[PDB]
Amino acid sequence: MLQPKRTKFRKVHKGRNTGLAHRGSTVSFGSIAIKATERGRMTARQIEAARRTISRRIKRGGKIFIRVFPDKPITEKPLEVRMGNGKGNVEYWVCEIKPGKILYEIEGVNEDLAREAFALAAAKLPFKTTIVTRTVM
Amino acid sequence: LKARYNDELKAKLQEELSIKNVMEIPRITKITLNMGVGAAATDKKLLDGAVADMQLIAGQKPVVTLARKSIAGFKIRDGWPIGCKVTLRGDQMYEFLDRLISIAIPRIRDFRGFSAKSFDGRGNYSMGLKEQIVFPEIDFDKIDRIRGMDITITTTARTDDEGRALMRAFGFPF
Amino acid sequence: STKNGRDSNPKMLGVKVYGGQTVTAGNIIVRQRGTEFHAGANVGMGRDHTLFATADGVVKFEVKGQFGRRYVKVET
Amino acid sequence: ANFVLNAQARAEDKQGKGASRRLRRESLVPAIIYGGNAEPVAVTLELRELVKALESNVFFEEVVEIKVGDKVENVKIQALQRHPAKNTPMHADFKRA
Amino acid sequence: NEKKQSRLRRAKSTRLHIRALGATRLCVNRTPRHIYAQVISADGGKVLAQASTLDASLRSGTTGNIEAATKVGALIAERAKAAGVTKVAFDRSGFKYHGRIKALADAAREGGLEF
RNA sequence: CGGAGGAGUACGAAGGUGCGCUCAGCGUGGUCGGAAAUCACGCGUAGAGUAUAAAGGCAAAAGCGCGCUUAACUGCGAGAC
RNA sequence: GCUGGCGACCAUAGCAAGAGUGAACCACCUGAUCCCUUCCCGAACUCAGAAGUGAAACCUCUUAGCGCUGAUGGUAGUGUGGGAUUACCCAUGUGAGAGUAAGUCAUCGCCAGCU
């Protein structure tokens, strides 16, 4: 369950998720990677579930690079509570995802095994993904 | 020293160290005496004795040194006096150097307390001496708790070799 | 019950006369909390860093000096 | 001489955001050619040919020929822009060599 | 060496204040061998009058003491009068107002410059 | 009844002026003495400070010292926000 | 052509490294008698002078090492009209930041000395 060790502020504005992921869309650490093709939110539990699935499939024979970190807190009201009376309490952490953002990379396994692991992990995610490989430019 | 240094050691060191210009010949600039008399706030008489000690060993008035920044681990406040220092230049530092080297070095019970090393890497040498005695001042009687000194001599010598040559020319044990 | 809910009254800072305008002596040019702009020729500085004109003329902004300070002056 | 890219001149009326989007809707790719002793020249490439060439690995370390009309330029690829989500090439840079 | 840098840092405030006031400046420079005194206009880029111990009349003397400074002050006052400046602001250029520079200033004041 | 902090003071110097001075950190050596007291030399560098919360500022330093002092004056006041 | 003072300008102008300069100028330099000075000290400030040296310092030259400047093209954003609602598309106008090619070891003014 990834989460920042400490934060400068506790609660943040909702914001709007727009635009494409020009940064963080290039394979840098491994040889094969999975990237999102539509935008959304990615929770820490989702990140952990996908990582566990990939590691279990590849039997820890390679290295998995996680390139998403959930540094955005999300609040909810305590339930049965009326509107107003201040902002709600922090409940979980998410990472904003834009189309093109790379989520996981794998180093040191066969392409077939890596693609099987990525197909297994894609079923755990709330958005559509695709598979990319390292290229010269 | 002064004149003796000028006549002998200038040319002697120039030939020894193969220095092309007389301006690069090592020279002694200043001598600094310091004591970090900590916890002086408790008694407030050890510092007063210390300034008298400095007036005795060096014929110069002492200047009391204040603490910079306040440390809770120690008991030093922001600006309380926690040390004493004097600075000697010109003929007076020569007098102090000659007087100390001649008479104080034999008087200490131990010997070879000062190495040929302990330069700061730039031709300046620091001394740590214990016991206010071994100087031309009254003995154990009529003096207060014994105190030690730090004696930092700063030279124009660029590195440790010209430092060592210059000070051995004066006659330091090592 | 929230522990927040306070704020101060507005202060209405900012540039009052822009470059190219004509001024009369005494006109306030810049209201500022600190010296975002510095006083050039024919411009005076008040106790609260307000910049005002000390002569009639045309206001001009510039960047000048070895620190790259912003200056505003009045040209007669 | 092994790699030859047939191109067309990309004029001022074909430069700009809207013109580039129209070109890419036509399945064409904008590119620029710059290098010592001559002014830059803007050209239009075919997406099909660009993808075919990029599939080869020796294309990134070999002198290639961009041919527009009768003019011929000997260049090496310098930079490429891809779509963040679709990986389609969108713009090319070519340094004279 | 920090000596000259400290001297310019000391002179900065007086020079900037004189420029802000807009008065004609009288600037002096001192070396162990010589003294110099030049009058500069308000904008600070033009020299109207000048005097020093490098002049043929004075170069044969000692040129590095109070006596030479007095004569240089008299010379600069005389030459500034011919140029046509009356009121000036003195600029000590970070030196202490004492000794040679004080003597030159007094010589100029007796010569007729009002400051 | 959105997210975060402060105030209901202090100071005859912590005000005025003339003159003067630069911080913080790290490394080398140096009695007690060290993680860190004071001394000396360097290295790189505004990261120090500004009575107090934050922001805008601060080399002519608005930061820091010393001597003399009361402009922490009276009557006003073109012109502006 | 060299040196000094005062400015314009504030890195394409700055740092770093390397090398040169003594006729004059400047700098170190002598010591401290009278001026003046250090919460100690002729270290700084100051005075009175030329026995030495251009060693240090300051200036001048060389180098793209660090730094700085920086296109063209494309991309993002965006005013107006229209079409859609994960925040896009079209017409029209506008147009970065980053990065790439490339550039840079400044350029002027007033006065005075020495050839």
Distance of alpha carbon A98 from alpha carbon A81, whole angstroms: 33
Among partner residues A99, A136, A137, which is closest to D84 by beta-carbon distance?
A99
Measured between alpha carbons, how far apart are the two ends of chain C, in Å? Answer: 60
Within 10 angstroms of residue A97's Cβ, the number of other Cβ atoms is 21
Tokens of B149: 């000194």
Distance of alpha carbon C51 from alpha carbon C70, whole angstroms: 12
**A125: CB partners within 8 A, 6+ apart:** A36, A42, A46, A50, A103
| Torsion region of E76: left, alpha or beta (phi above 0 gives left; psi -120 to 50 gives alpha) | alpha
3-state secondary structure (DSSP) of residue E86: coil
Cα Rg, chain D, nearest whole Å = 13
Residues facing residue C38 across a β-bridge: C71
Q: How many helices (H) and strands (E) does chain E have?
A: 3, 4
Residues facing residue D38 across a β-bridge: D35
Q: A108: closest CA among A64, A65, A66, A62?
A: A62
In the complex, which nucleotide's C1' lies nearest to the CA atom of residue B29? Answer: G43
Distance of alpha carbon B140 from alpha carbon B147, whole angstroms: 11
Name every chain D residue with its beta carbon within 8 A of the beta carbon of A36.
Answer: 85
The technique is: cryo-EM
| Chain D: closest CA distance from residue A127 (Å) | 13
Distance of alpha carbon E95 from alpha carbon E105, whole angstroms: 13
Q: Is D90 within 8 Å of D82 (Cβ atoms)?
A: yes
Q: What's A100's DSSP letter?
A: T
Look-up of token digits 């370390």: D61
Tokens of D23: 């070109």
- Going through A5-137 in order, the beta strands assigned E by DSSP cover 32-36, 40-43, 63-66, 72-76, 89-97, 102-107, 129-133
DSSP string covering D33-47: EEETTEEEEEEEEEH
Q: What's B64's DSSP letter?
A: E
Distance of alpha carbon E114 from alpha carbon A65, whole angstroms: 81
* φ, ψ (nearest 5 deg) of residue B166: -60, -45
Tokens of B13: 């060191």
- Whether CB of B135 is under 7 Å from strand F: the answer is no
Cα Rg, chain E, nearest whole Å = 13
Torsion of CA E56, E57, E61, E63, to 10 degrees: -80
A-side interface with D, Cβ within 8 Å? 20-22, 25, 35-37, 98-100, 132, 136-137
Give, for D77, the enclosing helix (H) or strand (E). strand D71-82
Q: What's B24's DSSP letter?
A: G
Distance of alpha carbon D49 from alpha carbon D45, whole angstroms: 8
Is D57 in contact with A136 (Cβ distance < 8 A)?
yes
* φ, ψ (nearest 5 deg) of residue D87: 65, 10
Q: Is E69 within 8 Å of E36 (Cβ atoms)?
A: no
Could you give the C-alpha distances from A116 to A105, A111, B85, C26, in angstroms and in order?
Answer: 13, 8, 77, 78
Torsion of CA E10, E15, E16, E21, to 10 degrees: 140
Distance of alpha carbon E37 from alpha carbon E103, whole angstroms: 12
- Whether CB of A37 is under 7 Å from strand G: the answer is no
3-state secondary structure (DSSP) of residue B12: helix
Between helix B10-17 and helix B160-170 the angle, nearest 10°, is 140
3-state secondary structure (DSSP) of residue C26: coil
Q: How many helices (H) and strands (E) does chain D have?
A: 2, 7
- Whether CB of B82 is under 7 Å from strand F: the answer is yes
Per-domain residue ranges of chain E: 1-115
**D30: CB partners within 8 A, 6+ apart:** D10, D20, D23, D24, D42, D43, D44, D45, D90, D91, D92
Residues facing residue B128 across a β-bridge: B150
